[PDB]
Amino acid sequence: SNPYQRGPNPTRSALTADGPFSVATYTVSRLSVSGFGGGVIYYPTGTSYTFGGIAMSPGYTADASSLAWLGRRLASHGFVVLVINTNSRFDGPDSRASQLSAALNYLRTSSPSAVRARLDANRLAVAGHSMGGGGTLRIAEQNPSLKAAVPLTPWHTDKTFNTSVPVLIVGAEADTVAPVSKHAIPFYQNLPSTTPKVYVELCNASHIAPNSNNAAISVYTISWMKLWVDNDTRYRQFLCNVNDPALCDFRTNNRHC
Ligand SMILES: [Cl-]
Ligand SMILES: [Cl-]
């Protein structure tokens, strides 16, 4: 049952470190693509399976290296992951959405054959930090064929996204760049009631929490992508009946349980 299932039965512990797949990396040079600023593809190797794809945007004034740990972590659990560099480090959220859109098309159509051989382009998702998270919400509204969206410490001036794409937002309690009461929580609240949605808020963390290995980001991001990109119900356990001391808030419409 479930053609998209990959990897062993998950444990919490297993989801805080790199997963069972070996990872290869491919550098996409800035000048080799129009529509975004290149970046790095992390993707499984040593295997004949295909996997869903994820495009992920860094945040404000940031480079793709800021999310390298997470690009690798996701890929190691069975995903083809392109972490972009933006055309300019100063690009805003809706610009980042357009470049996510270009990056997804690049992964499907123009990436190396080794990468395309590992990709099922029918199952794609998006994630991003800060302003990249705002871009993630924008693209999920523009393109509802996406399987999932994970905005990390997101920032946007628009607060309402009418999307049917399942959304998990990570806020940071002590974020002063994108205070959750002004960004993350309004985004969560304003999503359609019918859309499966989860908000998790990290105790004591600030805006830079996504820029380094973080156990909670790892668990919630892997689990949401597995549940929606792979239809993998083994990962519902981490997302349902949650009682997680790393969190200082938790909200859900419980559509995914
Ligand atoms: Cl913009
Ligand atoms: Cl398409």
Numbering used by the authors: 2 to 258
Tell me what the authors wrote about this structure, in their words.
Enzymatic degradation of PET using suitable hydrolases, like the leaf branch compost cutinase (LCC) variant ICCG, offers potential for PET recycling under relatively mild reaction conditions. Computer-aided enzyme engineering performed by Tournier et al. introduced an Ile at LCC position F243 to enhance the enzyme’s catalytic activity by further expanding the substrate-binding site. Additionally, thermostability was increased to 94 °C by disulfide bond formation between D238C and S283C in combination with mutation Y127G. In this study, ICCG was utilized for the application of a crystal contact engineering strategy to increase crystallizability and test the rationality of the applied approach.
After successfully implementing a batch crystallization setup for ICCG variant L50Y, ICCGY mutants were generated according to strategies to either increase crystallizability (Q6E and T110E) or, as a control, not to increase crystallizability (negative controls T26E, Q183K, and Q238K). Among the seven glutamines (Q6, 100, 143, 183, 190, 238, and 260), which are located on the ICCGY surface, Q183 is not located at a crystal contact (no neighboring intermolecular amino acid residue within the range of <10 Å). Instead, two negative controls with Q→K exchanges at non-crystal contacts and without an interacting amino acid in range were introduced, which should not increase crystallizability. Mutant Q183K also crystallized in a lower amount with a mean crystal size similar to the WT (252.9 µm ± 97.2). The duration until the onset of crystallization was nearly doubled (48 h) compared to the WT, rendering it “inferior” to the WT. No interaction partner could be identified for the mutants T26E, Q183K, and Q238K within the standard range of electrostatic interactions (<4 Å), as intended for the selected negative controls. Furthermore, the crystal contacts of the three mutants remained comparable to the ICCGY WT. Furthermore, mutations T26E, Q183K, and Q238K neither resulted in unintended electrostatic interactions nor affected crystal packing, as the crystal contacts remained similar. The negative controls T26E, Q183K, and Q238K, which did not aim to enhance interaction at the crystal contacts, showed no increase in crystallizability. The consistent space group among the crystallized variants of this study (ICCGY and mutants T26E, T110E, Q183K, and Q238K), all crystallized in batches with identical conditions, emphasizes these assumptions.
